[PDB]
Design an enzyme around this catalytic site. Structure first.
Site, PDB file in Angstrom:
ATOM      1  N   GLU A 192      35.570 117.429  69.218  1.00 20.31           N
ATOM      2  CA  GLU A 192      35.470 116.744  70.491  1.00 20.31           C
ATOM      3  C   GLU A 192      36.373 117.332  71.666  1.00 20.31           C
ATOM      4  O   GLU A 192      37.106 116.564  72.381  1.00 20.31           O
ATOM      5  CB  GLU A 192      35.717 115.239  70.258  1.00 20.31           C
ATOM      6  CG  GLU A 192      34.703 114.632  69.346  1.00 20.31           C
ATOM      7  CD  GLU A 192      34.641 113.131  69.403  1.00 20.31           C
ATOM      8  OE1 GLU A 192      35.583 112.446  69.938  1.00 20.31           O
ATOM      9  OE2 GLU A 192      33.590 112.575  68.934  1.00 20.31           O
ATOM     10  N   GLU A 249      30.194 112.969  62.529  1.00 18.03           N
ATOM     11  CA  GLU A 249      30.884 111.700  62.810  1.00 18.03           C
ATOM     12  C   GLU A 249      29.876 110.663  63.249  1.00 18.03           C
ATOM     13  O   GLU A 249      29.106 110.898  64.188  1.00 18.03           O
ATOM     14  CB  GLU A 249      31.928 111.944  63.899  1.00 18.03           C
ATOM     15  CG  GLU A 249      33.321 111.506  63.555  1.00 18.03           C
ATOM     16  CD  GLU A 249      34.391 111.864  64.561  1.00 18.03           C
ATOM     17  OE1 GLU A 249      34.628 111.086  65.536  1.00 18.03           O
ATOM     18  OE2 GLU A 249      35.039 112.907  64.320  1.00 18.03           O
TER      19      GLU A 249
END
Length: 448
Positions: A206, A371
């Site tokens: 991320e 995720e």
């Protein structure tokens, strides 16, 4: 049914998991940041502390056992830079080639440099990472290692100082072009030592969340917590370099698939009239991945999907609207009538299905859901969240999306950064006083 080779599992990150019993503890920019008195007092961070976490560093054996018997075959975890190089690496010199504009062409890190790095590294901690990865690998399972998951060395970034005095006065983090080189050393160091235990790599996690939350959405409680689009752009730019360079470094010591793991919000126009303008935003938001694609530095993509953002008009500019997606009421309902997680994130499996077809068409690369999960202390919605979202992946695959696995976030509850422990994402509850694991019923959807 999913294909024969489709992996089910989970993901963990060092900061959120490792710490919890004494011995574990590790100084990083993030550590300092969650301990900062000013921050705690102003509510900007929970005041919960990671040294009160699930203590995976010590208790990894049980956790693995649990995942195993839950039918899981793949884990994606991390390794923490600041744990491996508590002391700076700047003095171990490397030949670095740059072009006219100030791009990174190369960063030679031969075997000899690795040896010079061994002297100042924490080889004790490296050996412990081996034990941990081995514990899972020797069970005949798959492991994916992710090199960066937000915290940096203090000698790389001092967010307190940066915020008070500005980036010219302290280690600026992903604002200092220097940081990229040192990371590259880190990547090569890690490839060289751990490739025998790793099936697939990810350079980072991320990075879009890092540069955007750190230098634009101050409300997020991310470091260094000061407002500047120029800072954000610069951090983004150096993260791209870090990826490219780490990609080349891993390849020089390993023959395996290397990719990146990214935060993919699904973007939706409130009304049909915005459809175009919103697609423009998709492009900008994913540009980070687009770029790396176009340089040929992505063997695969880690999709991290949770909810969506809905855009509409406000005082003339088009912006993401409250009551939808990530901006819904915590523990309540979005405007759509879908419930939201304890983090106030709408339940929206549709987004993932749309997203996967978007990314498959746009990039034509192998993907793994690296995720997907929700903050739900009560296990009120998790069971449906799971099954809905797996259905969404299964649908996308039927229409050609190349998806090779799904990793839930996460097996256990852990430290959700500025929000502390109140956001519990685990299929397994953890009593942070006793460090005891108890499975939530949703964990049995997985025993399949």
């Amino acid at each position: 049914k999913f294909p024969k080779n489709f992996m089910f599992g989970y993901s963990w990150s060092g900061f959120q998991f490792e710490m919890g019993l004494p011995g574990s503890e590790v100084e990083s920019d993030w550590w300092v940041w969650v301990h900062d008195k000013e921050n705690i007092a102003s509510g900007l961070v929970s005041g919960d502390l990671p040294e009160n976490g699930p203590a995976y560093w010590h208790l990894y054996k049980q956790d693995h056992d649990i995942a195993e018997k839950l039918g899981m075959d793949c884990i994606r975890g991390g390794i923490e830079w600041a744990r491996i190089f508590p002391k700076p690496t700047f003095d171990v010199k490397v030949d670095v080639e740059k072009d006219e504009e100030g791009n990174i062409i190369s960063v030679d890190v031969p075997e000899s440099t690795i040896k010079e790095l061994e002297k100042i590294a924490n080889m004790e901690a490296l050996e412990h990472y081996r034990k941990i990865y081995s514990d899972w690998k020797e069970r005949g399972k798959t492991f994916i290692l992710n090199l960066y998951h937000w915290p940096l060395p203090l000698w790389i970034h001092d967010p307190i100082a940066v915020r008070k005095l500005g980036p010219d006065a302290a280690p600026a983090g992903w604002l200092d072009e220097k940081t990229v080189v040192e990371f590259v050393k880190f990547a090569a160091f890690v490839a060289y030592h751990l490739d025998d235990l790793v099936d697939m790599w990810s350079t980072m996690n991320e990075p879009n969340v890092v540069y955007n939350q750190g230098y634009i959405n101050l409300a997020s409680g991310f470091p260094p917590g000061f407002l500047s689009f120029e800072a954000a752009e610069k951090a983004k730019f150096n993260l791209i370099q870090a990826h490219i360079g780490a990609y080349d470094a891993i390849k020089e010591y390993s023959e395996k698939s290397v990719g990146v793991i990214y935060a993919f919000a699904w973007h939706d126009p409130l009304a049909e009239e915005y459809k175009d303008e919103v697609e423009e935003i998709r492009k900008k938001d994913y540009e980070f991945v687009t770029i790396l694609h176009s340089k040929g530095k992505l063997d695969w993509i880690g999709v991290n999907y949770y909810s969506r953002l809905v855009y509409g008009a406000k005082d003339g500019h088009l912006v993401p609207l409250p009551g939808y997606g990530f901006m819904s009421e915590r523990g309540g309902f979005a405007k759509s009538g879908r419930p939201a997680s304890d983090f106030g994130w709408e339940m929206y499996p549709e987004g993932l299905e749309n997203l996967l077809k978007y990314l498959n068409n746009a990039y034509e690369l192998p993907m793994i859901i690296t995720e997907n999960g929700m903050a739900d202390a009560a296990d009120r919605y998790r069971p449906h969240y799971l099954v809905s979202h797996l259905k969404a992946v299964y649908n996308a695959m039927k229409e050609g999306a190349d998806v090779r696995g799904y990793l839930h976030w996460s097996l256990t509850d852990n430290y959700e950064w500025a929000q502390g422990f109140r956001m519990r994402f685990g299929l397994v509850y953890v009593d942070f006083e006793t460090k005891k694991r108890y499975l939530r019923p949703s964990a049995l959807v997985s025993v399949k």
